[PDB]
Amino acid sequence: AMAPPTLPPYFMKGSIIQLANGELKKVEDLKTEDFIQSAEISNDLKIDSSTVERIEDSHSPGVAVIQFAVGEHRAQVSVEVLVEYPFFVFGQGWSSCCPERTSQLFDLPCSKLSVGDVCISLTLK
Amino acid sequence: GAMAPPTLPPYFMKGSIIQLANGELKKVEDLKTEDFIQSAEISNDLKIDSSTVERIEDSHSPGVAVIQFAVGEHRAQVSVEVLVEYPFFVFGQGWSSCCPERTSQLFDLPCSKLSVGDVCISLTLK
Ligand code: NA
Numbered sequence: 391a392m393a394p395p396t397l398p399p400y401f402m403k404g405s406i407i408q409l410a411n412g413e414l415k416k417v418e419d420l421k422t423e424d425f426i427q428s429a430e431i432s433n434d435l436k437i438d439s440s441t442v443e444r445i446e447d448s449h450s451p452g453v454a455v456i457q458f459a460v461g462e463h464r465a466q467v468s469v470e471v472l473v474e475y476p477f478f479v480f481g482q483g484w485s486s487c488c489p490e491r492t493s494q495l496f497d498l499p500c501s502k503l504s505v506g507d508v509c510i511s512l513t514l515k
Numbered sequence: 516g517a518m519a520p521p522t523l524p525p526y527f528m529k530g531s532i533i534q535l536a537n538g539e540l541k542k543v544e545d546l547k548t549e550d551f552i553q554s555a556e557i558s559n560d561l562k563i564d565s566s567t568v569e570r571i572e573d574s575h576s577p578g579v580a581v582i583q584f585a586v587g588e589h590r591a592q593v594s595v596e597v598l599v600e601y602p603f604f605v606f607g608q609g610w611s612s613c614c615p616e617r618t619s620q621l622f623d624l625p626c627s628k629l630s631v632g633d634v635c636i637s638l639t640l641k
């Protein structure tokens with residue numbers, strides 16, 4: 391199970407995120423709550439949360455194999471992702487497997503993605 | 516099917532403003548191919564990685580497309596299942612997806628039909 395080979399451009403710090411209420415916030419100052427109400431005021435989106443179960447090296451160098459427990463019912467999904475890929479962890483902010491690279495790439499301060507981290511995202515319905 | 520975070524579209528970049536390496540600021544919808552190359556010349560540790568669309572189909576799951584990529588210089592084979600509205604930025608083309616119409620109403624921006632041979636770019640390390 392592979393991840394898209396592209397990264398969204400809004401990760402380069404200094405980028406401004408528009409919340410569904412109208413207020414603006416720099417990508418690095420983004421707080422957990424900013425995800426919640428944004429999805430609570432959107433009749434298109436809701437919040438989906440996935441828990442990190444395991445992090446393994448992949449046969450491809452610089453790429454990690456993360457096993458996730460997705461949403462309620464904890465569906466198990468393993469996905470190969472770049473080590474630098476930034477996840478927003480519940481109550482911890484931006485996290486990746488290699489914050490050092492995420493700093494070299496986006497100048498974005500990251501925590502160390504760890505087992506049990508609840509990575510939240512905006513999804514549909 | 517069930518999708519991990521990275522597989523999901525970055526809906527959060529709707530109406531966003533990107534901070535380029537050159538210090539410039541651009542609304543996401545106004546990004547140009549040159550903006551990528553121009554901000555990749557700033558550092559030497561940075562470069563524009565390329566993934567070429569080799570094949571596009573429909574998955575066993577509805578609303579999900581099966582895209583085949585040649586990733587990077589060594590053209591690694593990569594098959595990805597994503598929601599049909601997943602925005603990719605294409606060399607000389609800009610935002611594109613398997614369902615441009617759906618991408619426009621969800622990310623608020625013009626979107627072209629993703630087609631075999633499109634080179635999807637992004638900023639990468641090393
Ligand atoms: Na460079």
